[PDB]
Design an enzyme around this catalytic site. Structure first.
Site, PDB file in Angstrom:
ATOM      1  N   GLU B  57       0.893  -1.115  -0.128  1.00  0.00           N
ATOM      2  CA  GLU B  57       0.301  -0.339   0.145  1.00  0.00           C
ATOM      3  C   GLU B  57       0.566   1.425   0.204  1.00  0.00           C
ATOM      4  OE1 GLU B  57      -1.586  -2.844   3.293  1.00  0.00           O
ATOM      5  OE2 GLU B  57      -0.234  -1.729   2.941  1.00  0.00           O
ATOM      6  N   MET B 160      15.406 -40.315  -6.280  1.00  0.00           N
ATOM      7  CA  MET B 160      16.192 -38.547  -6.220  1.00  0.00           C
ATOM      8  C   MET B 160      16.261 -38.748  -4.763  1.00  0.00           C
ATOM      9  SD  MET B 160      13.245 -35.457  -6.880  1.00  0.00           S
ATOM     10  CE  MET B 160      13.526 -34.211  -9.009  1.00  0.00           C
TER      11      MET B 160
END
Ligand SMILES: O=P(O)(O)OC[C@H]1O[C@@H](O)[C@H](O)[C@@H]1O
EC number: 3.5.4.26
Lengths: 362, 354
Positions: B57, B160
Site C-alpha cells: 500500500e 531422487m
C-alpha cells in the site's frame, strides 16, 4: 494443385473416424474406413464392423451405387488380397499400404484398370488405428497393455495376496472402456483364486461410446486368457461361466470337465516357470491382436523382464500404503529391469480421485 | 454493477499478480499487492518485496501521490501503522480481497469505513488465500505449512544427490519450489549420507530470473536439520552455505559452530524427537513454510504425525531393483490430487491434505 491435396485431408480424416467405430467389435480383423466422393459430396460411407461382416469398401460401395463411377474413393488400408474396378471408380487414396511384406502390393492392381492410385496420406493416424493387428502382422507378437493399480509409494492391496488392487469406481469404469477394444484379457491363476473375477465387459459401464456405435447386443467379450502352470483354477470359478471363451495356458492338460466355452493351450516351461514368450507367440498364431493384462505383482514383473510389454497403464490412488505392503514396488526378484526396454510417459490424466499414467517403451 | 464488477475483477487480478511478484523474498511477511485507480487509470501500483522494506500500500501510495485523492484502492489483504496512510492519501473506496487472518484483528476495514471510505471484502479471496497458504496457516493454526517432496521410479523405489536419476528439468523445478519456501527441513541421515548444501542456486532458475529476484536480492531459505544425537559436524557443507542453518536438537551440542548456526531444543516423545513440538516452535519462530527434502524415515514420521499439508511427487519413467529401494516407512493423514504435470521426461503430481 493444393485444392485436391487439402480436400483429401478432410475426407481421409472422415474415413479414419469411421474406422474407429468398429474398434470394439473388429478383432481379429483390422479397422478400415471408406468414404466415396463425387464432385463435392459423400455418396457412400462404410467401415468394418465384425470378422464375418462385409469389408468397409463393400459397405460404402453398396451405399454409393451407380454414383461410385465418377471420382474418389478414400480408404484407410489397401484393399483386396475387385469391387472398386466394377464399381467404376477413378482414383483411390489409401492411407497405408498393408503389412503382410510378401503378397501386399495389390494397390497397383487397381491402376491395372487405369485408376489414379495414391498412398501414405495421414499414415501416422492409420497406424495408430491398428497397433495390435499391425504388430501381430509385422512381428509374431500381440500388443500388450500392462495395467497396474498402485498407491503413491508403489505397493498394492495392502497384503501379498496376488489380487489386483482396483483403485476406485471411476478407475474401474475407465478400464472397462480400455478392455472393450482389447482383443483379449490376460491374467494369472493366482489372481483368479484371490479375486474370483469375471473379467468381462459390462456394457452399462461405458459412456456415450454406448451410442456412437456399439449398441448393447453387438457387445463383444474379449477372449479371457489365464495362466496356471498347476491347474489351480477350478471349473466352478466365475471366470469360465461368463459368456464367451476363456483360454487356459497350462503346463499340462487338465483332467476335469470344463464348459464348452473353455479351451486350453499347452506351453513349455522355462527354468521351472511357464514360458511367457512362447505363450505370447502362440497367441500370435491364434490371431490375437492385443492383450489387456490384469495382473498381480508377480505376473507384471515377469512381463516386464521378459520384455513383452508394449505399454503400461498405471492407476495411482492418493494413498500411502502401510508398513511394507506388496506392489511391484520395493520387492526383490526383479534384477535386470533398469537394463531392459524402459518406457517414457505418453499421457497423464485425472480419473476421479485417481490419476492415470500412460507410459510406453518408446 | 455488471461493468463495475468486471472492472473490479481486472484490477484485483492485477493486484494478485503483483503480490506474487515478491513470493521469493517476502517471508516471514505475507505477499501483498496494491493497485490504485483514479477514474479509469492505474495511478499507483505496489507490492511487498522484503520484510525490512515498506508495505505494498505504501509503495503504491507514493507512486500515486496526489492522484490517490479521488477513488479506489484494490488490496490483496486487509491493510496495515499502515491504515493511516490510505486515510491521509484521501481515497474514497478500498477493496480488500480478504480480511486479516488473525478473528481478533479483522476490523481494519471498520477503521477506513469510519473515515467515510467505501469498503468491501471477498473479491477473489480464493486466490488471495492461495497466495499466502503458509503465512495464513501460521496465523490461523500455530503451524507452518509443510510441503513434503518425494522422488521415485514407477515402482516407488527411491530414485531422487544432484546427479539425480530423475532428471535435469526436475532439479530445475525443485530449485524453483525451494526458492519460494521459507525453510528447507531435512534430517541428519540425509545430511550424513549426501552432504547436501540445501540452497537455491540462482543459475538454476529461468525467466523467474527476470520476473523479479535479481541475483543480489537472492534470499536463501532457512536450513533446518533434525538430529536427536548430534551427528552432523561443523565441517559438513550444509553449515558453510550463505544463510542460516538451524539444528533441531534433543540436547545441546558442545562444539564451536559458525555465527549463522542456531539450535532449537526439542522435548522427546516416546524416545524420539517430538516433531509436533518442533513444528510449533518453528511456527513461533515465524516459519511460514517448510519444503522437506528428507529420506524415507523422516518422510514417514511427518506423515504419521499428521504434519504434511501437501506433497509433491516426482516420478521418473524408470523401473528399479538396484538396492536403492524404499521411499516411505509408515509403521502403521490421506490425500487428494490437485495438479499433475510433466517435467521433462518426468511427471510431478501435487497432492493436498483434503
Ligand atoms: O545439495 P543440494 O542440491 O541443495 O540438495 C541435495 C539433495 O539431495 C538430498 O540430500 C536432498 O534430498 C537434497 O534435496
Amino acid at each position: 494443385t493444393l485444392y485436391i491435396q487439402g480436400q483429401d485431408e478432410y475426407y481421409m480424416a472422415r474415413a479414419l473416424k469411421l474406422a474407429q467405430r468398429g474398434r470394439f467389435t473388429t478383432h481379429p480383423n483390422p479397422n478400415v474406413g471408406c468414404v466415396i466422393v463425387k464432385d463435392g459430396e459423400i455418396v457412400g460411407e462404410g467401415y468394418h464392423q465384425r470378422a464375418g461382416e462385409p469389408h468397409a469398401e463393400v459397405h460404402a460401395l453398396r451405399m454409393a451405387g451407380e454414383k461410385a463411377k465418377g471420382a474418389t474413393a478414400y480408404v484407410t488400408l489397401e484393399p483386396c488380397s475387385d469391387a472398386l474396378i466394377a464399381a467404376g471408380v477413378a482414383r483411390v487414396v489409401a492411407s497405408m499400404q498393408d503389412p503382410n511384406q510378401v503378397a501386399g502390393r495389390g494397390l497397383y492392381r487397381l491402376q491395372q484398370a487405369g485408376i489414379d492410385v495414391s498412398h501414405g496420406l495421414m499414415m501416422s493416424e492409420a497406424e495408430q488405428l491398428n497397433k495390435g493387428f499391425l504388430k501381430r502382422m509385422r512381428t509374431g507378437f500381440p500388443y500388450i497393455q500392462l495395467k497396474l493399480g498402485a498407491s503413491l509409494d508403489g505397493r498394492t492391496a495392502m497384503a501379498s495376496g496376488e489380487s489386483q488392487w482396483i483403485t476406485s469406481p471411476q478407475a474401474r469404469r475407465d478400464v472397462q472402456l480400455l478392455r472393450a477394444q482389447s482383443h483379449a484379457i490376460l491374467t494369472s491363476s493366482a489372481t483368479v483364486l484371490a479375486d474370483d473375477p469375471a473379467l468381462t465387459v459390462r456394457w452399462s459401464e461405458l459412456d456415450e461410446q454406448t451410442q456412437a456405435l456399439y449398441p448393447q447386443q453387438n457387445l463383444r467379450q474379449p477372449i479371457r486368457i489365464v495362466i496356471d502352470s498347476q491347474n489351480r483354477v477350478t471349473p466352478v470359478h466365475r471366470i469360465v461361466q461368463q459368456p464367451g471363451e476363456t483360454w487356459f495356458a497350462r503346463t499340462q492338460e487338465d483332467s476335469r470337465e470344463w464348459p464348452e466355452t473353455v479351451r486350453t493351450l499347452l506351453i513349455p516351461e522355462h527354468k521351472g516357470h511357464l514360458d511367457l514368450v512362447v505363450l505370447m507367440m502362440q497367441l500370435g498364431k491364434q490371431q490375437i491382436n492385443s492383450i489387456w493384462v490384469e495382473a498381480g505383482p508377480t505376473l507384471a514383473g515377469a512381463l516386464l523382464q521378459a520384455g513383452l510389454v508394449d505399454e503400461l497403464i498405471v492407476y495411482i490412488a492418493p494413498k500411502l500404503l502401510g508398513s511394507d505392503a506388496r506392489g511391484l514396488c520395493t520387492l526383490p526378484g526383479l534384477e535386470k529391469l533398469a537394463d531392459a526396454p524402459q518406457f517414457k510417459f505418453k499421457e497423464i490424466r485425472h480419473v476421479g480421485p485417481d490419476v492415470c499414467l500412460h507410459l510406453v517403451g518408446a
